[PDB]
Symmetry: C4
Subunit: 221 residues, 4 copies
């Protein structure tokens, strides 16, 4: 499977799991060329993405292979800060945006939430509509070494070492948000023990489990 | 794209996003002739609307081109009060009606809610089943210059300068209501800063963003 | 449209609007012969109902035209107490059952809830699994002259003067329950004024509005 | 109907009712050979299960008929402790996992919840990612003679005397969790009387009702 069809599959999986709110959905894949990234072109939604819809652009959004969503220009900043990351996803999914609107960080209280235990930062500042510089610097510093970040009053972003892991973390974060919001009906949520959480975090992020789960999602589109 | 197929597309987008509760859904488009508007004929739902289902009627609901939903007669009153508005949508969508049933105005707490920041009025009075005169005057005075209004114990109405902007505001209001209701689980909601909210309000209501998002929704029907 | 296809259409509308929880769904239509009713045969769900699946049975569940769901035997008791009623629906729909599980009567707080204003009784007693005699007598006395009743720890039942009105009330009750439950997030719900509620109750239950809305739902199946 | 197609049908019913969260879904059927069980092979989701996808494995996960999901190895432990049980289901369904994340046992407050009255244990300890020995022993001791168990911070498991009853209990538990969570909006939930609950528990778990409801679900896939 080439990276262009893996990118298109990830977009279908994101829409299949209900992670699209207009054209806010963004996905990128680190290009072999420095200061460049592969992303979805402007005006296209997640579930209508084909391999021929992802284009390579540079730091100035010059489509150097194959017009990209200009709100993805900040992706190069976090790519710069994290060489281990090859793919990024940022959407305004319903449950994750509700958590972000209430300024609520994730509370790891169930097994499927552990992939984000000690791996989901929280950026309390909502900068409005900043330039790619301010937005890119703000998220990079707040993301740190973590695999995901909840952006208050905004949504989330996932930083995966592959398109598969970024999609994996993206689907699990949104369902983690739904789970946390529903469990809130019984009052404040008690988190699980950190030692077991990290243990479950490591088991659920295994490349064999991540790869097989992604393949399962592909066959569903 | 002609206005008749844009009207039919808007109805499909409204039903696609779950904004129909029986035959309560109403949509209108200002006619070139004064004291006349284009609307959907009686008995038809949103997702079964075709370009040949929208008819022109006057102040007395006389179908002067192509029987209209008589509960849309009040649309001419707000058209009279706002010459900048060319399209109107009024539905009893599930999340917006729940917000209206609880007498709850919108609290702008997330980025996708900003299109309604300082642009969503609240009519606390529910007049029951008034004549088109009383209902038209009540909503016009309460709507003011705003792009939308929550009608307590009823639903909402959007006033757009085009069918595309009315549909745009309609979809974002309903998902704003869903977001606010879900975020309420954590207690009262803290709104975002007004200066950034207006800034995000202006960016998200850009005609290029509104037009592209509408096109994306059309390709989905 | 014959009554056999109207019964089958009502079942599809009930399943279309998500009102099935296993084989608990029951629908009946008063037969021309006394002490007899038309109902759906045992083992069939709502969305697989055809006109040839409704059979006439008597007080002893003897299929005298065309084996019926024996839990519908109590329908004859309420038919006896209300000669104006020709159709009955009883389901364990998700939102209405949640309201019944919490022993919560309907609070009319939105326009689409008015068809049940002063028309939805509440039976606080859950009798378990009673015989058709006890269950039939208990519901008849508690239903009174009302068009619907919430059965605590159970579900609801609608009593319509036609299959169309029973389906109409059934769909609006379930969405009334969903609306009330969601609006509860903001605290206790303030009901609308009774005078306007009865006025809206009378407008929304007009046979022309009920008939047109039913036709719209049929074209959707 | 052979047991291989009954197993495949159960998986489709589980996915039809929304009981899949990645590849966490597990189903097993006791084999005629001791210390062996029939389960779904690794990497496959519930709704893509065919009769030719279930394989027989022993205590060491050696596929002795037809590679199985190794997280199902603990199924043999509970099979050992309960000879009356022939089928087991363990999923991380959304509503049941939210209940488990909040450490909330089921409160029987509605008729369709009674199949689990005095039949749903609660394991407060979440062991993380234990070996099949620890996980198998922990669940067996906590399950006892009950037909289901809520696993805190995890999900649930159902122990049925057939694939049909395990699927039956599985679907009703998840909808019981959804019902309880939604009813929580009105405050703490008052449970029904135990005598009637056990009576309704016995009526709803009748093999004729369980078998007919399973057949209805099969015709829906
Ligand atoms: Ni964004
Ligand atoms: Ni209205
Ligand atoms: Ni019942
Ligand atoms: Ni598990």
């Amino acid at each position: 499977r080439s990276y262009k069809e893996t990118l298109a599959y990830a977009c279908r999986i994101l829409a299949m799991t209900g992670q699209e709110a207009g054209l806010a959905g963004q996905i990128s894949f680190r290009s072999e060329r420095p200061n460049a990234y592969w992303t979805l072109r402007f005006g296209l939604g997640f579930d209508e993405a084909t391999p021929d819809d992802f284009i390579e652009v540079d730091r100035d959004l010059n489509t150097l292979t194959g017009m990209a969503n200009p709100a993805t220009r900040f992706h190069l900043w976090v790519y710069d800060a994290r060489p281990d990351v090859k793919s990024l996803i940022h959407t305004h999914s319903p449950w994750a945006s509700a958590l972000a609107a209430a300024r609520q960080p994730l509370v790891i209280a169930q097994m499927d939430m552990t992939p984000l235990h000690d791996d989901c930062a929280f950026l309390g500042e909502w900068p409005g509509v900043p330039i790619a510089d301010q937005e890119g610097v703000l998220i990079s510093e707040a993301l740190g070494r973590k695999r995901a970040i909840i952006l208050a009053h905004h949504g989330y972003l996932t930083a995966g070492v592959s398109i598969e892991e970024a999609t994996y973390l993206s689907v699990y974060l949104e369902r983690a948000a739904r789970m946390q919001i529903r469990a809130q009906a019984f009052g404040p949520l008690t988190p699980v023990d950190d030692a077991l959480a990290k243990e479950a975090h490591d088991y659920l992020l295994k490349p064999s489990i991540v790869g097989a789960t992604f393949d399962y999602w592909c066959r569903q589109t």
